[PDB]
């Protein structure tokens, strides 16, 4: 019965990723005065299936100079980690109920960077290497401030349990209490998912295909699926953390509908942002995250430690 739950989680997520590819193409097309996919299937509804079937029937290449073991391990790690980061999300009930869900997401996301690191190194080509060192720099840029923002926001939750976030925001969204932290968190999640304007690792104009330039076919497809699953997962985490849906214990379907709508809106905002802006230089991302975000985050952390004590508004569950 638990395996049925695992499958009912992981298969719909892959289908959502497949159709998010089409939705992104159509949103970008219509923001660019064109249409996007509308031929293969009514309204391009069969385009993701054609893409997947073309990729998995295409020859996979193992580079002559590459390390083969790491070259094959990296996409497996990427996809499995992207699938695993979904299990503690309460929708309104989680698949795996943890005391410290937030720390689990933190650790698994910080493990996910080694997929890019090891694929870029194991390709044994120059553009892949440049992509990998850009990944190193990006993680160094965003990690500390991301963690401090999470701590500051959760100081009103009372714990690290994700389900407590539903009862914390029973009356008001957490975005009305910490909107500067919400802004910094949104930019941090854009940087954490290698999304425009922070899509430095791929670096398409600058680095051809970057870290995954050597990759082709099915192995290449796995990287794409992992990235888009990460997009959806991070936006769902943001929706749970800042726009809290109201949960009726006798009707969880209403909560599920509302939460799915909110995360879809955040994902569409990601696509909008990609369509609207140019790319950062990767030293400029580090300067932004270390000279503007970090001091404000430290000050707001001090403020959010002090405020519940001053106002006698400390949450329960020591």
């Amino acid at each position: 019965m638990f395996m049925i739950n695992i499958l009912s989680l992981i298969i719909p997520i892959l289908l959502a990723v497949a159709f998010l590819t089409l939705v992104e193409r159509k949103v970008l097309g219509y923001m660019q005065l064109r249409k996007g996919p509308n031929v293969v299937g009514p309204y391009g509804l069969l385009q993701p299936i054609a893409d997947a079937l073309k990729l998995f029937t295409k020859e996979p290449l193992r580079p002559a100079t590459s390390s083969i073991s790491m070259f094959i391990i990296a996409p497996i790690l990427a996809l499995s980690l992207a699938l695993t980061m979904w299990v503690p999300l309460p929708m309104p009930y989680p698949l795996i109920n943890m005391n410290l869900g937030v720390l689990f997401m933190l650790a698994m996301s910080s493990l996910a960077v080694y997929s890019i690191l090891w694929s870029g190194w194991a390709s044994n080509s120059k553009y892949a290497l440049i992509g990998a060192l850009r990944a190193v720099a990006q993680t160094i840029s965003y990690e500390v401030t991301l963690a401090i923002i999470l701590l500051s926001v959760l100081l009103m939750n009372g714990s690290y349990t994700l389900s407590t976030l539903i009862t914390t925001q029973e009356h008001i969204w957490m975005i009305f209490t910490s909107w500067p932290l919400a802004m910094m968190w949104f930019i941090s999640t854009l940087a954490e998912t290698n999304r425009a304007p922070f899509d430095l690792t791929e670096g398409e104009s600058e680095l051809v295909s970057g870290f995954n330039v050597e990759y082709a076919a099915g192995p290449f497809a796995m990287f794409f699926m992992a990235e888009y699953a990460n997009i959806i997962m991070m936006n769902a985490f943001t929706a749970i953390l800042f726009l809290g849906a109201s949960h009726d214990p006798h009707t969880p379907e209403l909560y599920t509908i509302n939460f799915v709508l909110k995360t879809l809106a955040l994902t569409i905002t990601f696509l909008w942002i990609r369509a609207s802006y140019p790319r950062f230089r990767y030293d400029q991302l580090m300067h932004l995250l270390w000279k503007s975000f970090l001091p404000l985050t430290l000050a707001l952390c001090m403020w959010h430690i002090s405020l519940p004590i001053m106002t006698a508004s400390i949450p329960p569950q020591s």
Partner: protein, 215 residues
Amino acid sequence: HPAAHGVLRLVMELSGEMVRKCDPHIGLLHRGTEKLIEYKTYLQALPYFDRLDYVSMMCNEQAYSLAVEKLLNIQPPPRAQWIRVLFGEITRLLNHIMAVTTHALDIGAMTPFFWMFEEREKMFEFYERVSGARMHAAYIRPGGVHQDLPLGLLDDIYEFSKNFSFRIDELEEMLTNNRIWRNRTVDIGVVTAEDALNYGFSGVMLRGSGIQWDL
């Protein structure tokens, strides 16, 4: 390479991502045009100037025609010269759309390219209506122009021109005041006026350094 702007083998020397030396290797599109011109008549050599700078065709035709007219000691009729200047300015608009939108695309802004290439398409329609070819018309000739305008072309040119400023405004709203665009462009590739003059620069590459020159 997507950012190589065609066929360029730019051999680069780097310490980390810093650039120590740039060594542009060219000739990947050297087709031996000048010898071929030496094997043709003056009318036969004219279409080569279309394919020299394939973003500004009629301007190249105009330069070659002016040179041949100077060597012939003849003068084009006034209507031909007005048509030439009109289509030269249309060509300048085409070239500047290409330059700005592809620069933005390299830097990472993809949308203005799509917005402005529709205007490029309409101007290609003007090219084809006057000559039958969208980009290598060969309309401007040493004695003037090949054919007169069709009876309803000026109206459509006016209709395009009365609306193009809003498209420019939308592009400007996307780029000019964006802090990411300014971070990627301000203080990048600074060149002094004297160095620009000595290195043989021309056009915007002189005007951006304050030199008040325009042919």
